Amino acid sequence: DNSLIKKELCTEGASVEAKKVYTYLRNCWGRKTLSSTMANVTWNVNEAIWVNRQTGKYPAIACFDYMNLPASPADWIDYNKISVVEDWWNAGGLVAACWHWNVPVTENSSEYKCMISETDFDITKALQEGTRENEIIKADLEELAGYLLLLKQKNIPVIWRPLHEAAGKWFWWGKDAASYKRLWKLVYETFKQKGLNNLIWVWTSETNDRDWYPGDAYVDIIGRDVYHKTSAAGLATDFDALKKAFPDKLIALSECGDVATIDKQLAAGAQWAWFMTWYDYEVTKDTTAPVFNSGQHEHADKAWWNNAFGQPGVICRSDLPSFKL
Template identity: 55%
Template sequence: MSHYKNRIAGACCHLLALLFVFVTCSDGGDEKIPELEKPKLVSSVPADGSENVSTGEQTILLTFDQNIVLASPHEIRLNGNEITKAAAAFKELTVTAALEKATAYTLVIPAGKVKGPTGVSADEITVRFTTRGSANSTINKTLVSPDPSPQAQRVYDFLVESYGEKIISGVMANVAWNTHEAEWVHTHTGKYPALNCFDYVHLYASPANWINYEDIRVAEEWWGNNGLIAAGWHWNVPSGANSNGHGFYAVGKNGGDGETAFDIRQAVIDGTDENSVIKADLEKIAGNLLLLKEKNIPVIWRPLHEASGKWFWWGAGDAASYRTLWILMFETFKTKGLNNLIWVWTSQTDDYDWYPGDDYVDIIGCDIYNKGLTAVSGIYDSLTDEFPDKLITLSEFGNIAGLSDQWDAGIKWSWTMPWYDYNRTVDPSSAAFNEQTHIHADIQYWEKALENDYVITRDQMPSLK
């Protein structure tokens, strides 16, 4: 019997010892039962304290250290206003809201609304950020051309003042040296676009009875009616690839039509045959642009466009050769006294290696075709982030989201310009000219665009003479 009593006594002592440990731990002893971890915010986009955040509809991304769920109602607020679009998935919480420019924002997620997988809730979370100011607040106000003409400076000042507040409407000449697209828009809407862009594509043949860039009456008339003048240059060089022996497409980029094997890498080396060709062409184009300068007509000048796409000969070599060619053109024009130019470089995005440099570029353009709103917004945000001190313009487009949708999404170009529809506007006296369809921007597009008071037409332009 005593043996069993001893065993029972021992068991009781063991139980008392376990009870002592339990009481000691619960009373603040050395060993504590671990607490379950609260979800913690690891990062946010935009980060807390960010500045120059993009405007329009934006998604704020918050990443936590563990999977989360969002309580309902979540009661998340942005500047005191309840958010309607918020969702949690795995470790991420997304909050979508429309952001206004030049605004300080505070996002607040109340305590208890974000829960981890064990049901433990996060503390209150606050993220503060500021959207970019008025679009023109950081823009360089000085033109790159030394001692710019008064007219060029006034045009540029107007572009800067309008940026972010207005969009200047524009059109492209049908092939070369006319205002046919502008007349087509006017015929069907009663309004002229504010900007007309010409193309010196046939410079190699001018002057001729079918093309003569030395006859500048069409440009004088447009400028005389307060219209803005832009110009580009599909630079035709000797090719032998087609009947006229000239082309601007790189070999393999247009099925043989208008292609040239002209080598930009050789063209920028002094003394080569190719170098002689481009220097002669630069002399000729400078002479034509000087005709406009003599009439005090400024030109928004957009040469050597879409280089990084490599479909034109000036981009078919390498970025270094392209930059050298751009600077050669700039310096040649400077020695000629061409101070009436506002220089536009066209980006294909993610092509900074091709950028000639801030000393040679006033405005950044981009050409967009067949893209939806999300893609257009991404391109715009990319360029405004990369070039915060430059005007950003939609220098060509076709079949993209409507201008109103872009504006509402915070996409505010300096100007926009659909490419021409050859068959629609080549002959203003034709039956085709009376039709309202268009391969890039039909009259329905124009009617919707011109309903907005932020779209500038030619009749709304001030005299910048």
């Protein structure tokens, strides 16, 4: 059943909690699919709260985004304030994080973006020791490693998914496979130097992009991000292709929106390790606003989520075992 999936994380001496989380996911492979929601933008669990108000159940995994490194610390975003992550973990939920790596729109700008169409930041220069771009990404990694170390010191592991969708060539890190792989290894080695042993590394594949794969030494789980795909058969075809490319690794639907209901996906063979719905900015940015209660959602509405939780294979937060002690 799951004998092909690797038993060990790529990180030597990974934390007890990271190993427990990974081992649980490995045990679920082919049998269960975890539910997950994205934060509203970055640093909250507003979509998890929204899902509970629609269904009575919470998602198993809450994901956060370190996108706003340039502004942190600020009145409105401070990644040193880890209570929102701590509180989720202590309520028994799993913690995930991604990272829209925002860089100056142009040299000396005060605007920060991540799409190639919105920044001229050049990864090839960022990898050359001593350049302006290199100093920028080193300082970002130092700041980010410090924020992640706050979670490590609280014994909170993170299902960590940086540098995603590289081969789509729409983010500044998607210029070319060779420089992309060098950047992934720099992030990994920088974090290793900082002592971050609480991370499970998720590499997001666009399918048929093996030239972009950073390597077994730097990756634990494969992710796929899919929007606007309502053929469950097509979703299963993607799932199968990823399983074939990476037969030793769990495969997750790490982002989705406007996709076939989970019952159809599962019946077609798309047996993802988890699915994470993207956020609807206007609906969940304010949990006190009337729109919070309506049930409509750009990515997965009330009916979609009640369908998902109606399926035997789908895990909610209260289904999870304990990952602490």
